[PDB]
């Protein structure tokens, strides 16, 4: 792989790692609440293992 492209690839990968996305926070703190509430609403209760 020519280094110019190689330099580009590590660059774009770095950019992805720097995006200030909200999803990871939502998974850890907010999504569980939504599940906990909706569990009482669906016609079929949750079934886990």
């Amino acid at each position: 792989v020519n280094d110019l492209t190689r330099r580009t690839m590590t660059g774009v990968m770095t950019a992805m790692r720097q995006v200030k996305t909200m999803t990871p926070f939502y998974i850890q703190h907010m999504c569980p609440t939504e599940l906990s509430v909706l569990a009482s609403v669906t016609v079929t209760p949750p079934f886990q293992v």
């Binding site: 590590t10 660059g11 770095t14 950019a15 720097q18």
Partner: protein, 50 residues
Amino acid sequence: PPNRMVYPWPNQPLPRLTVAPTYDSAMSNWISTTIAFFIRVVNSVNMTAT
């Protein structure tokens, strides 16, 4: 106090002879240091990776 005014920058009395651009005024100093800082920012590792 009466007959006085405040001023955000340092000030001097009016010059005597012809004017010319200078480089020791407060604003000029503020400009130079600001530029110097950002240049340092651009060369920081964070920029180099991308």
